C-alpha cells in the first residue's frame, strides 16, 4: 500500500488523507472508500492513517 500525494489538516498528529484517485476501486488496505459513480468509477480513500504512506512512484535519487 502507498500514497503519492497526501494533504494534512491543523493537528499534530496531522490528519493526512491520501488524495490519490484510482479507477474502479481503492487498494486493499483502505478501510473507507468512496467513488464518483461514473463508469469506470473514480475512487478515493477517505481513511485517516498517517503521516502520509509510502510513495507509489519509485524513488530515483541514488545512482549519481
Amino acid at each position: 500500500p502507498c500514497c503519492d500525494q497526501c494533504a494534512c489538516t491543523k493537528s499534530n498528529p496531522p490528519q493526512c488523507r491520501c488524495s490519490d484517485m484510482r479507477l474502479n476501486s481503492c487498494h486493499s488496505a483502505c478501510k473507507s472508500c468512496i467513488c464518483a459513480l461514473s463508469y469506470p468509477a473514480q475512487c478515493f480513500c477517505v481513511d485517516i492513517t498517517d503521516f502520509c504512506y509510502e510513495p507509489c512512484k519509485p524513488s530515483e535519487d541514488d545512482k549519481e
Binding site: 461514473s38 468509477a41 473514480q42 477517505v46
Partner: protein, 241 residues
C-alpha cells in the same frame, strides 16, 4: 417542463425498471464506441446538465429517448455536443460543485419520450425527508461487469447535510445534497443523471448523481451535486450562450 407525457409509476441497486419513456429528460452519455459511461438530464431543447467528473468531451454523444439500450426499436436521438461547459469551480479532489453543461450542436426534438426536467430557483427549499427519485443505467449490483440495458429508478429520502455528515463528515460541502441510505443506492454509471422531487405537480431537478460508497452500500447515502446551489451559474451560462 417536468410533466412526463408517460406518467412514471413508482412502487442503481435495489431499484426497479422505469415505465418505458416515463423519465423523458434522462439522457445517456456515450463515447465513440457507443459505450454508456454517464447519465444526464435535458433542461431544454439545446442543453444537458450532467456531472463535471464524468469528463465529457465533444467526442462523446448525448443519446435521448432511450429505455432499452439493448433494443433497436426506440426512436432515439443521437445528438452531437457542440461545446462543454465544465464548472470552473469543480474541485476534483473534493468532488464539489460537480456540474457540467452540454450545449447540443443540433436541438433535440421534444416528444412523448423526450422533454425537459424543471430547474429549481436558488432559494427553493427541499426539506430533509422528502421522498424523491433518482434514475439511471448504472450497476444494479456492485460486482456486476455490465450495466443494465433498461432504465432503472428508485425512490429515496433526502437528508439534511448535518445528518449526512454523520456518515461522511467534512467531505460534505454546501454544494452537495445527500439522499438514500434507505435500502437503495446509486451505483457505477449513474453519475450525471437526475435526482428529482415533484414540486407542485412537476418533477424538479434537485440533485445530480455525484459520488458515494465504493460498494454502493444501501445503508449509506448517495451524494449529489446540490442543484439549488448551482442553478444561477446554470442560468447565466445559458444566457451568455
Amino acid at each position: 417542463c417536468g410533466v412526463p407525457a408517460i406518467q412514471p409509476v413508482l412502487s442503481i441497486v435495489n431499484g426497479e425498471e422505469a415505465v418505458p419513456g416515463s423519465w423523458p429528460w434522462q439522457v445517456s452519455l456515450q463515447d465513440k464506441t457507443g459505450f454508456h459511461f454517464c447519465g444526464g438530464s435535458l433542461i431544454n431543447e439545446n442543453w444537458v446538465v450532467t456531472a463535471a467528473h464524468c469528463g465529457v468531451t465533444t467526442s462523446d454523444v448525448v443519446v435521448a429517448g432511450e429505455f432499452d439500450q439493448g433494443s433497436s426499436s426506440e426512436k432515439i436521438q443521437k445528438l452531437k455536443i457542440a461545446k462543454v461547459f465544465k464548472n470552473s469551480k469543480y474541485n476534483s479532489l473534493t468532488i464539489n460543485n460537480d456540474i457540467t453543461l452540454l450545449k447540443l450542436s443540433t436541438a433535440a426534438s421534444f416528444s412523448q419520450t423526450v422533454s425537459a426536467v424543471c430547474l429549481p430557483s436558488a432559494s427553493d427549499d427541499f426539506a430533509a425527508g422528502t421522498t424523491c427519485v433518482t434514475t439511471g443505467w448504472g450497476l444494479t449490483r456492485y460486482t456486476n461487469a455490465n450495466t443494465p440495458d433498461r432504465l432503472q429508478q428508485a425512490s429515496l429520502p433526502l437528508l439534511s447535510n448535518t445528518n449526512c455528515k454523520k456518515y461522511w463528515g467534512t467531505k460534505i460541502k454546501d454544494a452537495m445534497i445527500c439522499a438514500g441510505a434507505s435500502g437503495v443506492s446509486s451505483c457505477m454509471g449513474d453519475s450525471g443523471g437526475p435526482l428529482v422531487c415533484k414540486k407542485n405537480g412537476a418533477w424538479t431537478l434537485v440533485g445530480i448523481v455525484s459520488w458515494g460508497s465504493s460498494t454502493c452500500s444501501t445503508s449509506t447515502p448517495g451524494v449529489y451535486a446540490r442543484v439549488t446551489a448551482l442553478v444561477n451559474w446554470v442560468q447565466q451560462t445559458l444566457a451568455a450562450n
